[PDB]
Amino acid sequence: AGLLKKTTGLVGLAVCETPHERLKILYTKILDVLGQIPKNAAYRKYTEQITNEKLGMVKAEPDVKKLEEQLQGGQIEEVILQAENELSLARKMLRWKPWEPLVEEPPANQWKWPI
Amino acid sequence: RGEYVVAKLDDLVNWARRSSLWPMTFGLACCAVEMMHMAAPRYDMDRFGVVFRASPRQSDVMIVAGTLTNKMAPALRKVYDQMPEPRYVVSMGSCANGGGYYHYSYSVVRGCDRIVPVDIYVPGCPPTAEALLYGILQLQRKIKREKRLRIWYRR
Amino acid sequence: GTSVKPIFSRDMNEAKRRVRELYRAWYREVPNTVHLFQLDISVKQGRDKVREMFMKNAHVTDPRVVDLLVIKGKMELEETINVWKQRTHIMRFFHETEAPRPTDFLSKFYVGHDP
Amino acid sequence: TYKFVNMREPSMDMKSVTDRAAQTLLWTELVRGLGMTLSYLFREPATINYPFEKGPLSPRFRGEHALRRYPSGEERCIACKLCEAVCPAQAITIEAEPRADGSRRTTRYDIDMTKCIYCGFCQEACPVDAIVEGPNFEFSTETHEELLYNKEKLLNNGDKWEAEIAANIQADYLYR
Amino acid sequence: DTRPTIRPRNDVVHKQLSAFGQYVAEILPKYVQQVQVSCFNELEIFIHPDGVIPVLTFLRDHTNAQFKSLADLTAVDVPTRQNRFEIVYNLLSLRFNSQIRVKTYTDELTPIESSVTVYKAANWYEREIWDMFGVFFANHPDLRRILTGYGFEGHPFRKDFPLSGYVELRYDDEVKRVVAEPVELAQEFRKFDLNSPWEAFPAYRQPPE
Amino acid sequence: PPLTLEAIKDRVLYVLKLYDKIDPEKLSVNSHFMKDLGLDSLDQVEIIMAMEDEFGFEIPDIDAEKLMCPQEIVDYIADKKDVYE
Ligand code: SF4
Ligand code: SF4
Ligand code: SF4
Known part of the structure; x- marks a missing residue:
């Protein structure tokens, strides 16, 4: 364990006295929205791989310090904030459905260098 | 003599006009470094009676320093008009006096003299601090070569 | 082929609609800019100068280009009222200094060997 | 590796608060500024007595140009035209036509001071070290036209700042 | 380095960003x-105009990306292609110390939805492109002229506006x-027509037409 | 006192008379701006603006295009002003 973090070292980014539980509830939350997107999508094929992966590390080891090394995400507040925008990123591409092939192929000589 | 009294008065009127004139800047570009890098202790100019001071209503000579863009052109003209008479302008740097590097570009006027009546030209990219100090010295010597009251009396 | 993405217009109707209150905004703009910027040119002088600039952009027949002229058109009026521009900027359209370029064949022939 | 700057954790003991309270009540950090400034006052200045003495320079100093010449007086310029081929501001204009003794050397060498950048690319571009950056800098003029140099002006400065330039280029050709 | 002249090349970086390129794909x-x-170990993403917001x-x-530092946004205007304005962003990720380039294509008329929602850094990296190039980005807070004279016409950094421009100032x-x-x-x-008439690099040789 | 339609009729036709291009001759009760009087759509924006100063009123652009003759100008503003004399 450890005594409360006096300062996370990043202004604006405050402290959270409930590291593992807040990470977990946010983590099942992103598991929830992962359901609506189809499983066959490479999004869901890749997020659930890292979902079940580092949900185990937070669940197995409850200490703040050991979790920091295992996830290499600085302080927990950074990680949960990082996972927070992962939730928002999950919501945006829920409606986007970027799984069908290219919208349209590029023009013939649009790419390729030199001109 | 009639010419002698106007001669003594003319000297007294402009003897310190070349020693109490106080420079004015606009400090556009890298020439704005030597602008006040001369105000640094090494090439002291405060000793020469000159001392940098914006105060556009209460200054004598403006050292135009940097690249003169068209976008700023109104600002300089309104400053020079607000400038009291007598007034002199010094074009420091190749860009200020003649465009220099950017002479061919679209957003710089080719030389400051196209905008303001330009006195002694000090060249340099940038002019090494004493080169303007030499240029300022030339301006003060030019002040001596003046017959203001003499011309008035001749008329 | 003709498939292009909009910004503000679909049909010339709404395209001509945008230039309508663009004129309306500009029509009411003349009385204040001349007085507040302290000019010499008359109010109707400005109004027709606004007017003629419309006629220059009149031969285009593409809803796709007019709006680009509209946004360019709406990119100037606020620059005048909010004293962003200066006297050399707004009297510039009042093309005054330059000599009048000769128009007949002889006068162009006399001035120089250019078209 | 890194180190913090702001964090201080000022101790709240009776002795420490006394120093902080004393500092605020009877100003001490401000008097420190007075002590530092007064110590500055009792120190000889660094000002230089121009023009009676002028600050130091280097053998590589880049100033007013000059077209040099050989030991016998021949123009080193041959109008190879490399200098304006690298002149970043296109301040160099060169033309060449025949010279009387069968030669076809240059006629025009105008480096516009108001266009020039004094980067020194010209002297490095010259294969015969014809155009160089002279040591002089006191050539301020009151007419824009004066700074517009020509062939004769360049050659005259070459004959004026000759001994100095020759010594500098002799003291610097090993570096280049 | 047995060849001090050449820049030494790295492969562990080469394949990893290559793998990450597939990952994003x-x-x-x-x-x-x-x-x-890239041989310079700068992987680049080529996206579609509607794809600006998603990617x-x-x-x-x-x-796995965390690319949240907007380095720059600019245009590489290429007349020879129908989409002359080539809008390109540069992204930086502090966590994985990598730089991502996302490249689009656009005509003079087609818009691009503003990226201010993604990065508010673009706020001014958006204005100058509209000024310097003329391409207009939709739903942006402001499209003001930031790097030109007031009332200036055209777009300078295009390959159409000449170096000297069209208008010159003078006090009268x-x-x-x-x-x-x-x-x-x-x-x-x-003019300095300096492009040699001899082929320089066989590697980057343009395919025969 | 209210603002009658004969008032509306004259003052709508009054400032229409004041603007420089319109000649008194071709002006009539109909005096359609496009095919009777003869102007441009921007000039149509011009006159409706002149109506704004005459009345001290406001008209939207959604209905400014249909105001194709003084009769509609008279009828349209009388409709919203809710005065029918
Ligand atoms: S003359 Fe040289 S130093 Fe001075 S503004 Fe121009 S480029 Fe900069
Ligand atoms: S100065 Fe040197 S480089 Fe320039 S034209 Fe003369 S010989 Fe050639
Ligand atoms: S020093 Fe001046 S003349 Fe020589 S190459 Fe540079 S800009 Fe041109």
Whole structure:
């Protein structure tokens, strides 16, 4: 364990006295929205791989310090904030459905260098 | 003599006009470094009676320093008009006096003299601090070569 | 082929609609800019100068280009009222200094060997 | 590796608060500024007595140009035209036509001071070290036209700042 | 380094960003037309105009990308292609110390939805492109002229606006103001046709037409 | 006192008379701006603006295009002003 973090070292980014539980509830939350997107999508094929992966590390080891090394995400507040925008990123591409092939192929000589 | 009294008065009127004139800047570009890098202790100019001071209503000579863009052109003209008479302008740097590097570009006027009546030209990219100090010295010597009251009396 | 993405217009109707209150905004703009910027040119002088600039952009027949002229058109009026521009900027359209370029064949022939 | 700057954790003991309270009540950090400034006052200045003495320079100093010449007086310029081929501001204009003794050397060498950048690319571009950056800098003029140099002006400065330039280029050709 | 002249090349970086390029490709293959790694180890993403918001948001919050530092946004205007304005962003990720380039294509008329939602850094990296190039980005807070004279016409950094421009300033006595006029040059900017008539690099040789 | 339609009729036709291009001759009760009087759509924006100063009123652009003759100008503003004399 450890005594409360006096300062996370990043202004604006405050402290959270409930590291593992807040990470977990946010983590099942992103598991929830992962359901609506189809499983066959490479999004869901890749997020659930890292979902079940580092949900185990937070669940197995409850200490703040050991979790920091295992996830290499600085302080927990950074990680949960990082996972927070992962939730928002999950919501945006829920409606986007970027799984069908290219919208349209590029023009013939649009790419390729030199001109 | 009639010419002698106007001669003594003319000297007294402009003897310190070349020693109490106080420079004015606009400090556009890298020439704005030597602008006040001369105000640094090494090439002291405060000793020469000159001392940098914006105060556009209460200054004598403006050292135009940097690249003169068209976008700023109104600002300089309104400053020079607000400038009291007598007034002199010094074009420091190749860009200020003649465009220099950017002479061919679209957003710089080719030389400051196209905008303001330009006195002694000090060249340099940038002019090494004493080169303007030499240029300022030339301006003060030019002040001596003046017959203001003499011309008035001749008329 | 003709498939292009909009910004503000679909049909010339709404395209001509945008230039309508663009004129309306500009029509009411003349009385204040001349007085507040302290000019010499008359109010109707400005109004027709606004007017003629419309006629220059009149031969285009593409809803796709007019709006680009509209946004360019709406990119100037606020620059005048909010004293962003200066006297050399707004009297510039009042093309005054330059000599009048000769128009007949002889006068162009006399001035120089250019078209 | 890194180190913090702001964090201080000022101790709240009776002795420490006394120093902080004393500092605020009877100003001490401000008097420190007075002590530092007064110590500055009792120190000889660094000002230089121009023009009676002028600050130091280097053998590589880049100033007013000059077209040099050989030991016998021949123009080193041959109008190879490399200098304006690298002149970043296109301040160099060169033309060449025949010279009387069968030669076809240059006629025009105008480096516009108001266009020039004094980067020194010209002297490095010259294969015969014809155009160089002279040591002089006191050539301020009151007419824009004066700074517009020509062939004769360049050659005259070459004959004026000759001994100095020759010594500098002799003291610097090993570096280049 | 047995060859001090050449820049030493690295392969562990080379394949890893190559793998990450595939990673982003699979995640959202709707917009990425193709991904190109570089010998300089600068992988680049080629996206579609409608794809600006998705990919930019994707690299911003994703747990394996975290690219949230907008380096720059600019245009590489290429007349020879129908989409002359080539809008390109540069992204930086502090967590995985990598730099991502996302490249689009656009005509003079087609818009691009503003990226201010992704990065508010673009706020001013958006204005100048509209000024310097003329391409207009939709739903942006402001499209003001930031790097030109007031009332300036055209777009300079295009390959159409000449170096000297069209208008020149000068202070005139009659009007008592610095007025404009068609440009006139004391010296014409001389031409330096310097591209050699001999092929330089067989590697980057253009395929025969 | 209210603002009658004969008032509306004259003052709508009054400032229409004041603007420089319109000649008194071709002006009539109908005096359609496009095919009777003869102007441009921007000039149509011009006159409706002149109506704004005459009345001290406001008209939207959604209905400014249909105001194709003084009769509609008279009828349209009388409709919203809710005065029918
Ligand atoms: S003359 Fe040289 S130093 Fe001075 S503004 Fe121009 S480029 Fe900069
Ligand atoms: S100065 Fe040197 S480089 Fe320039 S034209 Fe003469 S010989 Fe050639
Ligand atoms: S020093 Fe001046 S003349 Fe020589 S190459 Fe540089 S800009 Fe041109």
